[PDB]
Each structure stands twice: as C-alpha cells, then as structure tokens.
Amino acid sequence: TSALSLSNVAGVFYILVGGLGLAMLVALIEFCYKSRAE
Amino acid sequence: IDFSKPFMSLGISIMIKKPQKSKPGVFSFLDPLAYEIWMCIVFAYIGVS
C-alpha cells in the first residue's frame, strides 16, 4: 500500500532525540553547577 | 447465402477475472503507518521515559 515510510516522517525523530540530548545536558549542567558549589 | 432475421443480437464485450472482498487483515489498523515507524515509536517511547 501507501503506508507512511520512515523517510516521510524522519524530522520528528531527530528533533525528539535531539531534545532528549539537550534535556540531559541541561540537567547535568545544573547538577555540575550545584555540585561544585557544595 | 440468404440469412434470416437475427435470432440473437450480440457483440464484442470485455471479460475480466471475477473479483471479490479483500478480507482486511485482523491487524489492518496499523497500515496507515509503516512497520518501521511503529517499531521506532516503541523505541522512542522507551527512550523518552
């Protein structure tokens, strides 16, 4: 049939994984800051 | 020869193989999205969580 291939919707996955990457980095930046402050 | 009046009017027609129902598969609701999207949705879900 004409089922939507992954190529058709492949930017929502990069964004998703990219946001997860950014999210972890932001969390670790907060952690590192407070950890050094201690 | 001298034919009589036609006792059967006919012509050239078109014959095709008789079709039928397409018996939609049990799991035919996942067609709108390819198999890889479905597999990669589970992966993305397990990763976001």
Side-chain angles (χ1 to χ4, degrees), chain A residues 17-37:
Chain A
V17 177
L20 298 194
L22 168 61
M24 291 179 73
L25 169 61
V26 165
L28 300 184
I29 287 160
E30 160 168 55
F31 176 48
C32 289
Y33 168 40
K34 300 191 303 182
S35 176
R36 297 294 297 173

Side-chain angles (χ1 to χ4, degrees), chain A residues 3-6 13 16 20, chain B residues 31-32 34 37 40 44 48:
Chain A
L4 268 161
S5 51
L6 192 64
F13 279 87
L16 181 57
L20 298 194
Chain B
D31 286 0
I37 295 172
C40 293
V48 164

